[PDB]
């Protein structure tokens, strides 16, 4: 019922913030705010309303929301959405991103600012559209529908000091990544509603109809090849995993495009919701490999992180870093690892967005982002150097943040399920400590090692600080108190564990 | 009692409310808010011990929330106070009111006030929530928080590199001892379900009848974490260097907080240690080993505070012997008397670093009895409780209960190489006190100074933990033995310092002679580096990590997959030349085709 609305939203949103510029420069931000809070309004009462604290595992599917249409009849296929516990906490952390990337943007008079506006809000469209999808053909649509404004919003509003062929690289890398990764999603689909037509005689793109799909073994392989290679570049696992820094490089400058939809974890989601499900027996058989690759991808990225002379790759090689853990909380086939996996990316997607939301005012104080021309800016900054601190701390998983909590859950479904990867994680762990020590001391501590660092900086703004310490005080929360988000998700994860292991 | 949880809240409101001023209150505001917010922490640890032993020692339990669960995996938020409970409580608690007392005096006219003092106090808060766990994810909770108000407080001085490399160095060492106790804690869980302590020795006999490798394993990472978190083998080399912070933070993490929560962790889980006997007696041979080896460091060292942090390890070392003898009651009253001398040490050593302009080298420093006569007695009754100088300092009465109860269990060994140990531990203490205090001239303190002057004393040995029924008691020694062991370390003490005083008192002449021999050079520079330990770990672990990110840093799986987009460029470049514009190449294509498709209808026919 509101799942309709709560895609639509956005993108009505978005064409009010374009149709609204000539009314003024200073109105489409406003149209984006109320346009997110609507959105975030109306994710929270889906949470008050659907009851999924008392909701039971009852076996897939089970939707605490659905909403239906035909699309394209000729092939089956409906605009079919349904929401139940992961989506709906998606759903909420996309809202919640959003209105952080719209509020982090606010000082933007540009005369072309109803686009960029508009551009944001598809984005966040797509990515709520990706999470609340359940037909293949629409959540492969809405995965491909909200890359072109990620798109031209790195092309044409990127990183100004840098240049533009820099930014076009960069954005035609991060596009035909996502794109070729999507078309070989496709194809996997395509071949699934295939051999279901061939094996029942019904034209069906429904997720709840394709499971019940007879598949020998070698086919299945191939199709959850299809889709964790999607997965794969978009989460991202490595080696697939070049275009986050690429992009992150060159985003605009206020940081808002990683918020908008490079940050969320649609990805993991998809691997849960959709490789796990259709395919167990074959994600059975993946899992030594997807594991490993997600120990390659956790060292790897600590490695790149600690070598990075730039804040935004290293906070993109901790990004790498933490899903390379969610990627081996997936294939474990736990109850414990998979609510440690959605804590983790929760936290993660805070985190991260403190830490991108910090090193965008950090370059707008001190006008560049190599770490080898600051330093000791604790002395010549107000509230920035306590707070990266703090998120810094947050991100190598300290305990009072959610980051502990979900890395800890995920280790421990793993050692109930395997030693060796769990031991190498936790390791991994280490690095993670080291890589966000380094950064921290690079950036903020020491003497200066410039003279735009010598200098005093003004401080931050009432609002800008006002969404930080929100993100602080909803990661402390979530450290301290993550019951109520383990209890919106427990039916969910239930379900998917249970089908990935009775079937197995 | 129910007011447990407020010796987490207090230091909790002191920390964000000093955290959030950012300096725009004054020095004394700031002091105010600090000092009581640990004080009436150690105030209502004084209530709640009033109204524990007035309820007949009952383990009492205070829950707050459920911190997690996810079907059989149920972390609760709970406190547990029993008598070890109780003892590290108040500890943490009234030393920690000392040296707050103390920074309150020594932090005046610095930058940062506010935040030292809300890192000091979230380090309480931390500590608090460590001793006060019953499962084994809060206590790595307060384990971890520990850590980073331990690496926070360490490079205080931001300014200076070799702080924040020292802090790093630090929080790298004690995170991989947590890692060790994650593993402990996965272990743990995997095989009893639970990670409350008193459930753990409960359901451990009963799982554990057919196989003993995995609670074996178990108590290994635990033996593990501890000595990431007590700077013992292998995980010791961070204490030396992370020696460059404050003297109140070198007095917190050396005498009250951080190097006891090894301590604490294997008193606490000290039944899944009595089951497994080798874990146990593994714990007591590194503390051995840790003791002589921190000794011999000491020995040769230039620095005070350097000497005072290999004496802090070889005392953990002590109480490591002691947990490994089952001498569990004399670890913890050894932990307690410790708490008190190296505070009294590290605070008289400060005040020593303030006297003497900001210098660090012993050499230079000469004939400081004149100038300050109150921190000398200080110097001097820490070094003589450090030395366990006998029948008059709870040094002495702490390291007799600890060598009786190695006796007592066997262990021969353990008891000489503790006994070398104490003749080496007066060696280097009286050999620093001499050399700083003898020679040629070159209301807010004072209180602390003098609490820890008594509490140095017998004075600190009349207070005994309400350990009876908690840990287990150890074994009777014979009237004769107990007698014969308390006048051989009498006479070892008294021969150790009658010994620094015939070298290091007088001109030191022979004591050249030993020191510039080839072989003497040789052993001081073994000693004077923790036996080559930091090198190897530098050699070992930093340089092929530094190495790998060099080699690293270009991205070689990013170059990896643009190798199709180079073949693509290079493949379209090449097929470019085609379009040369000429008319009879293009017929000439078509001929070429022509022949290629009549060809291959010809062959596949
Ligand atoms: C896990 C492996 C198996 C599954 C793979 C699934 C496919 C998706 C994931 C892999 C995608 C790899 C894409 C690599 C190229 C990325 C795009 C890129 O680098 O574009 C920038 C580059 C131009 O940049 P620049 O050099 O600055 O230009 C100035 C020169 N005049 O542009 C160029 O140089 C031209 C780019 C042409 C188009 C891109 C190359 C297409 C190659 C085939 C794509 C399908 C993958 C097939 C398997 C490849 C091998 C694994
Ligand atoms: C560059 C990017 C794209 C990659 C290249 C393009 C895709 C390549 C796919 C190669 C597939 C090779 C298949 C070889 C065997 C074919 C014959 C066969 O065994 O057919 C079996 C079956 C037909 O017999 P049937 O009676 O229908 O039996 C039903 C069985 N369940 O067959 C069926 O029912 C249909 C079988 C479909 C198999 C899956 C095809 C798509 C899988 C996803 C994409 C490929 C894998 C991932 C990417 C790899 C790296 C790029
Ligand atoms: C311009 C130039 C540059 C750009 C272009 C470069 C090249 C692009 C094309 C690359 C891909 C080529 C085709 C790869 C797929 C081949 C499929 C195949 O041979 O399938 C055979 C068989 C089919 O299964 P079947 O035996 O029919 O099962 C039914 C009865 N059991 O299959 C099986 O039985 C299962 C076989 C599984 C292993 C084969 C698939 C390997 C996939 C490699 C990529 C993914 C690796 C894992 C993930 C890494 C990280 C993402
Ligand atoms: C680790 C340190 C020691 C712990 C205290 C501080 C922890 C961090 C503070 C911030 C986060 C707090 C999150 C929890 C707040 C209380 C809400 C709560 O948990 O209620 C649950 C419980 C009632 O529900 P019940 O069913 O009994 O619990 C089982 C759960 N299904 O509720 C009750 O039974 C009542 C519990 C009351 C607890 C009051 C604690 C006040 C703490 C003030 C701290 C101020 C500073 C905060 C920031 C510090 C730095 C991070
Ligand atoms: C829980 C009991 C203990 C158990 C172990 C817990 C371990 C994990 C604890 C996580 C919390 C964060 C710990 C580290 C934070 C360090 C922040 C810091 O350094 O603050 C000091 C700084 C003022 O220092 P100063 O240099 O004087 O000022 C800047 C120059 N003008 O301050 C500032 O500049 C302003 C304040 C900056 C941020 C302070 C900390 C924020 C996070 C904690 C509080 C969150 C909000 C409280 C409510 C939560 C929800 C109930
Ligand atoms: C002890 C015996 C048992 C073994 C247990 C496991 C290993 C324990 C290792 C203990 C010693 C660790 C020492 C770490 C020192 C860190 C501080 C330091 O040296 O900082 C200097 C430097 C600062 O960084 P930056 O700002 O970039 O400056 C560049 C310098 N010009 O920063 C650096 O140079 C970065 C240093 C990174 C250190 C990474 C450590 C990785 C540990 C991996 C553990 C593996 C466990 C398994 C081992 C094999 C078992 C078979
Ligand atoms: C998807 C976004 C998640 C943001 C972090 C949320 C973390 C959980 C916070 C829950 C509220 C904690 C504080 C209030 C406790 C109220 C308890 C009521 C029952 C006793």
Redesign the interface.
Same mark, same amino acid.
């Given at each position: 019922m509101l799942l309709p609305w709560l895609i639509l939203i956005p993108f009505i949103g978005g064409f009010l913030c374009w149709q609204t510029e000539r009314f003024g420069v200073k109105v489409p931000r406003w149209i984006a705010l109320i346009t997110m809070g609507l959105t975030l309004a109306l994710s929270l009462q889906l949470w008050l309303q659907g009851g999924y604290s008392l909701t039971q595992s009852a076996g897939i599917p089970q939707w605490q929301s659905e909403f239906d249409m035909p699309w394209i009849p000729r092939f089956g296929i409906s605009i079919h959405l349904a929401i139940d516990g992961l989506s709906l906490l998606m759903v909420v952390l996309t809202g919640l991103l959003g209105v952080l990337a719209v509020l982090c943007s606010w000082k933007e008079i540009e005369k072309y600012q109803g686009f960029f506006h508009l551009n944001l809000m598809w984005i966040l469209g797509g990515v709520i559209g990706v999470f609340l999808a359940i037909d293949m053909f629409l959540f492969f649509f809405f995965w491909e529908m909200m890359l072109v404004p990620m798109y031209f919003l790195i092309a044409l509003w990127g990183h100004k000091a840098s240049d533009g062929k820099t930014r076009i690289t960069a954005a035609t890398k991060f596009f035909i990544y996502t794109q070729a990764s999507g078309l070989v999603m496709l194809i996997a689909i395509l071949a699934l509603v295939f051999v279901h037509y061939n094996a029942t005689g019904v034209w069906t793109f429904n997720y709840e109809e394709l499971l019940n799909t007879p598949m020998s073994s070698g086919v299945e392989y191939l199709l959850m090849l299809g889709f964790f290679i999607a997965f794969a570049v978009k989460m991202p696992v #490595?080696?697939?995993?070049?275009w986050l820094?690429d992009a992150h490089s060159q985003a605009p400058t206020a940081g808002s495009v990683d918020l908008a939809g490079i940050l969320l974890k649609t990805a993991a989601y998809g691997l849960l919701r959709f490789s796990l499900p259709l395919f167990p027996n074959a994600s059975a058989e993946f899992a030594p490999i997807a594991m490993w690759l997600g120990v390659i991808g956790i060292f790897?990225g600590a490695?790149?992180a600690? @070598? %990075?002379t730039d804040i935004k790759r290293l906070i993109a090689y901790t990004s790498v870093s933490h899903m390379g853990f969610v990627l081996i909380a997936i294939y474990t086939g736990s %109850?414990?690892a998979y609510?440690?996996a959605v804590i983790q990316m929760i936290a993660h997607g805070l985190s991260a967005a403190g830490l991108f939301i910090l090193c965008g005012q950090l370059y707008e104080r001190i006008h560049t982002r190599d770490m080898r021309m600051m330093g000791?800016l604790? +002395?010549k900054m107000?509230?920035l150097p @306590?707070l990266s601190l703090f998120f810094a #701390?947050a991100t190598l998983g300290?305990?009072?943040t959610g980051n502990?909590?979900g890395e800890?859950?995920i280790?421990?479904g793993s050692? %109930?399920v395997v030693?060796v990867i769990? =031991?190498i994680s936790?390791?991994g762990? #280490?690095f993670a +400590? =080291?890589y966000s020590? @380094?950064m921290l001391?690079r950036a903020?501590?020491?003497?200066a090692k410039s003279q735009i660092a010598s200098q005093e900086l003004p401080g931050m703004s009432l609002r800008e600080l006002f969404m930080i310490l929100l993100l602080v005080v909803l990661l402390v929360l979530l450290g301290?108190?993550? %019951?109520p988000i383990?209890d919106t998700s427990?039916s969910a994860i239930g379900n998917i564990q249970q089908w990935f292991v009775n079937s197995v | 009692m129910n007011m447990l949880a407020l010796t987490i809240i207090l230091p909790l409101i002191g920390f964000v409310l000093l955290a959030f001023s950012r300096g725009r209150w004054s020095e004394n505001v700031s002091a105010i808010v600090g000092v009581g917010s640990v004080g009436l922490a150690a105030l209502v640890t004084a209530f709640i011990g009033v109204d524990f032993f007035a309820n007949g020692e009952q383990t009492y339990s205070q829950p707050l929330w459920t911190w997690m669960s996810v079907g059989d995996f149920n972390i609760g938020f709970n406190l547990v106070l029993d008598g070890l409970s109780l003892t590290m409580l108040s500890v943490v608690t009234g030393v920690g009111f000392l040296i707050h007392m103390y920074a309150s005096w020594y932090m005046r006219g610095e930058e940062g006030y506010s935040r030292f003092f809300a890192y000091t106090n979230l380090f309480i808060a931390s500590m608090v929530v460590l001793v006060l766990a019953d499962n084994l994810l809060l206590m790595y909770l307060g384990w971890e928080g520990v850590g980073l108000c331990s690496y926070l407080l360490i490079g205080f001085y931001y300014t200076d590199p070799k702080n924040g490399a020292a802090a790093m160095k630090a929080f790298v060492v004690t995170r991989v001892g947590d890692v060790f106790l994650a593993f402990a804690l996965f272990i743990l869980y995997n095989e009893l379900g639970t990670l409350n302590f008193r459930e753990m020795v409960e359901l451990a006999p009963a799982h554990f009848a057919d196989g003993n490798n995995m609670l074996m394993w178990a108590t290994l990472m635990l033996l593990g974490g501890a000595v990431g978190k007590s700077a013992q083998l292998p995980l010791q080399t961070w204490l030396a260097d992370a020696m460059a912070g404050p003297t109140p933070v070198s007095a917190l993490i050396h005498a009250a907080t951080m190097v006891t929560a090894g301590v604490y962790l294997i008193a606490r889980t000290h039944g899944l240690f009595l089951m497994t006997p080798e874990v146990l007696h593994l714990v007591g041979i590194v503390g051995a080993v840790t003791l002589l080896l921190a000794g011999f460091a000491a020995l040769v060292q230039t620095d005070i505070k350097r000497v005072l942090a290999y004496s802090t390890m070889s005392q953990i070392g002590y109480m490591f012997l002691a947990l490994g003898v089952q001498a569990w009651d004399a670890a913890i009253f050894h932990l307690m008397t410790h708490a008190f001398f190296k505070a009294l040490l590290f605070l008289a050593s400060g005040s020593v670093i303030l006297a003497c302009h900001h210098e660090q080298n012993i050499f230079k420093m000469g004939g400081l009895r004149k100038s300050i006569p109150l921190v000398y007695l200080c110097f001097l009754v820490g070094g003589a409780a450090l030395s366990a100088l006998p029948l008059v300092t709870a040094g002495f009465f702490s390291k007799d209960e600890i060598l009786a109860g190695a006796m007592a269990n066997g262990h021969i060994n353990l008891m000489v190489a503790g006994l070398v140990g104490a003749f080496m531990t007066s060696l280097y203490t009286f050999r620093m006190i001499f050399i700083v205090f003898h020679g040629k001239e070159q209301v807010t303190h004072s209180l602390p100074l003098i609490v820890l002057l008594i509490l140095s004393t017998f004075v600190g040995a009349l207070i005994v933990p309400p350990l009876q029924g908690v840990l287990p008691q150890t074994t009777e020694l014979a009237h004769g033995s107990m007698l014969t062991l308390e006048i051989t370390s009498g006479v070892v003490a008294v021969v150790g310092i009658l010994l620094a005083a015939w070298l290091w008192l007088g001109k030191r002449t022979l004591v050249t002679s030993i020191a510039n021999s080839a072989p003497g050079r040789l052993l001081s520079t073994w000693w004077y580096n923790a036996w080559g330990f930091d090198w190897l770990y530098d050699k070992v672990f930093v340089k092929p990590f530094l190495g790998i990110a060099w080699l690293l840093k270009r991205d070689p799986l990013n170059s990896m997959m643009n190798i199709p987009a180079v073949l693509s460029r290079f493949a379209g470049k090449g097929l470019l030349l085609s379009e040369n514009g000429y008319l009879r190449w293009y017929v000439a294509s078509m001929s070429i085709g022509a022949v290629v498709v009549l060809a291959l209808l010809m062959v596949l026919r």
């Open positions: #490595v080696p697939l995993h070049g820094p790897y490695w790149m600690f @070598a %990075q %109850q414990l609510q440690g000791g604790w +002395s107000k509230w @306590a #701390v300290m305990p009072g502990f909590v800890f859950m280790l421990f050692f %109930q030693p769990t =031991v936790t390791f762990l #280490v +400590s =080291v020590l @380094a001391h903020y501590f020491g003497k301290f108190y993550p %019951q383990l427990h | -």
